[PDB]
Amino acid sequence: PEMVRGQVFDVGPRYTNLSYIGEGAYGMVCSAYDNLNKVRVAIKKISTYCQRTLREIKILLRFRHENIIGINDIIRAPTIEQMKDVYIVQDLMETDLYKLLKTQHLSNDHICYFLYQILRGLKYIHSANVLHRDLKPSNLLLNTTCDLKICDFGLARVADPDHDHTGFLTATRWYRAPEIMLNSKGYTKSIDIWSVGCILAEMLSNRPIFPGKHYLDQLNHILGILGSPSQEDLNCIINLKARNYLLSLPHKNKVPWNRLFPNADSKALDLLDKMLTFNPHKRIEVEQALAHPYLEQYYDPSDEPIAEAPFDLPKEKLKELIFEETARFQ
Numbered sequence: 001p002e003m004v005r006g007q008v009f010d011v012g013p014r015y016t017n018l019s020y021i022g023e024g025a026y027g028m029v030c031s032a033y034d035n036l037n038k039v040r041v042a043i044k045k046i047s048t049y050c051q052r053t054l055r056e057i058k059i060l061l062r063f064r065h066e067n068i069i070g071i072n073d074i075i076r077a078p079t080i081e082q083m084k085d086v087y088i089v090q091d092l093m094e095t096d097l098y099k100l101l102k103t104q105h106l107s108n109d110h111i112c113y114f115l116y117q118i119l120r121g122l123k124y125i126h127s128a129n130v131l132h133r134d135l136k137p138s139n140l141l142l143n144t145t146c147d148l149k150i151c152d153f154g155l156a157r158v159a160d161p162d163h164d165h166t167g168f169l170t171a172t173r174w175y176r177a178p179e180i181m182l183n184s185k186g187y188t189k190s191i192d193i194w195s196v197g198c199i200l201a202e203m204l205s206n207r208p209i210f211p212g213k214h215y216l217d218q219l220n221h222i223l224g225i226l227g228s229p230s231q232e233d234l235n236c237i238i239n240l241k242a243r244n245y246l247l248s249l250p251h252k253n254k255v256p257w258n259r260l261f262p263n264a265d266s267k268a269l270d271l272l273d274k275m276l277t278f279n280p281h282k283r284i285e286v287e288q289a290l291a292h293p294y295l296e297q298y299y300d301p302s303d304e305p306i307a308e309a310p311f312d313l314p315k316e317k318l319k320e321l322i323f324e325e326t327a328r329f330q
């Protein structure tokens, strides 16, 4: 067994010369040489935590799309008794958008291209009636030619708008839609669109637009820029405790986008405005975002595929489910 930073990375004959890349969720990430098609790859070691592991495997194996990270191989023991670690193999990318925003100014041409590819991937995901629910810059991988792939489906769910309602004060904080702090479990597609709006804002300025320190700090940051919600938007919130909290706040005026981003393309600001809408019912959907004049140069519905079909247990059946789902790579 090759060892990496004091750890067993038992990835067999096929994958050699492992280099530490970092640690995402789940554990260690190394790159490795694949001797079957002579190209380096990324390998994640996996040791509840079982739930999100299973969820992701199940989704990523069903999805096939240029803008979604795939699964090339899965390595595990031949038997359930012997199975401890599971190794996930994926295409090696150069960087993620979070690391990129820390260090690099982006041209409008790059912002436009990135945003197109995010939406193109999201169009597919939503057509399968799946919510990602944790879109943020670190879950967006880029290769050396700026091709983009969405990763980490650990928090993903099937859409369920009939059961979205919940109480007041019930994923990553900065990219959370406002309705989540107010009356929503985040079971509708509109919460992903909000996260893309945040990512877009972050691409225009190299900084998180709403960096809340905590739950309600997040909300007052949003309202500090969007302004106090209208009576019509408030009427949509029927839970008295959410509504009366909002009514207890001082009046805030909308800060116009062109003041926050004085050198942004005006078309980008017009799309941003429609993504970061307080009322989820008024918020643009992904197909409409794709058709927006900002993305005209890329928009091509015949090259924007949709999925062919849309989508509580003891720890014993879960180990077993992971085993069964990973059998195809044996």
Ligand SMILES: Nc1nc2[nH]cnc2c(=S)[nH]1
Pocket (backbone or CB within 6 Å): 021, 024, 029, 042, 069, 090, 091, 092, 093, 094, 095, 141
């Ligand atoms: N560079 C890099 N490439 C990847 N492919 C799948 N995951 C990764 C990560 S976390 N980093």
